[PDB]
């Protein structure tokens, strides 16, 4: 379900050219484009079957699929928080569908590994898996994301381990790392590549003299 704020003429709005979810065929599931918001009291919509908001136009499309629905079954969902950073901790939608739909665009745009609040998701397919690990765990990128002090660094297992290793450097409190998956789904290879990062950086008793 969704919050009542989006199913309200006052609090939430429809501007022409915004995306919307049609509350029908429930188990949602329908996306549409707004054309007009006060067609004879109701909301006219264009059910669909790289666009800036900022120019407002309907999507030009032959054979339109217009339908009338009131503003009790439409929710504005798009823009064309919600996990704006690669850390999708924010998550403006309470449902897990925001995690899945953000991961839809992250699957299409090939960045894949994604810090998820406390969690992280990697959804890499069986196709040439060693190429995916070798880009994100090469000795180049190994010392790279040590060198940056988080901020601009991509949300990676390098940051996931560096959180626990910064509470090593200052907090001196107990930490925990763990990887999940399914039947031989390279989660062991994620953990071992993450594990090399633990004792690469920081001088971990560089070989001293006889005095100490």
């Amino acid at each position: 379900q969704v919050d009542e704020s989006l199913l309200r003429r006052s609090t939430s709005f429809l501007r022409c050219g915004g995306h919307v979810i049609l509350r029908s065929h429930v188990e949602r599931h329908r996306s549409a484009q707004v054309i007009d918001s006060n067609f004879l009291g109701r909301v006219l919509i264009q059910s669909t079957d790289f666009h800036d908001r900022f120019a407002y136009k309907p999507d030009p499309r032959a054979h339109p699929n217009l339908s009338v629905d009131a503003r009790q079954e439409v929710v504005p969902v798009g823009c064309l928080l919600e996990g704006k950073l690669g850390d999708l901790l924010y998550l403006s939608a309470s449902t897990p569908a925001a995690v899945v739909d953000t991961l839809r665009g992250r699957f299409y745009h090939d960045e894949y590994f994604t810090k998820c609040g406390n969690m992280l998701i990697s959804v890499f397919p069986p196709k040439n898996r060693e190429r995916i690990f070798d880009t994100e765990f090469s000795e180049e990128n190994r010392w790279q994301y040590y060198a940056g002090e988080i901020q601009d660094l991509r949300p990676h297992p390098f940051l996931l381990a560096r959180r626990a290793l910064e509470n090593v450097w200052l907090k001196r409190r107990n930490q925990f790392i763990l990887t999940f998956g399914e039947l031989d789904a390279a989660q062991d290879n994620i953990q071992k590549e993450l594990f090399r990062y633990i004792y690469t950086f920081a001088p971990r008793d560089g070989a001293k003299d006889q005095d100490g």
């Binding site: 992280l120 930490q175 790392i177 999940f180 789904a185």
Partner: peptide, 29 residues
């Protein structure tokens, strides 16, 4: 597994502050 429980039993006034990761596939496995 109980030795993994025993290192949890060793010190740790707070629980070990965790960081987790899942490794799954894009399609259905």
């Amino acid at each position: 597994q109980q030795l993994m429980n025993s290192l949890l039993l060793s010190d740790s006034p707070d629980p070990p502050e965790c960081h987790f990761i899942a490794s799954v596939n894009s399609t259905r496995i």
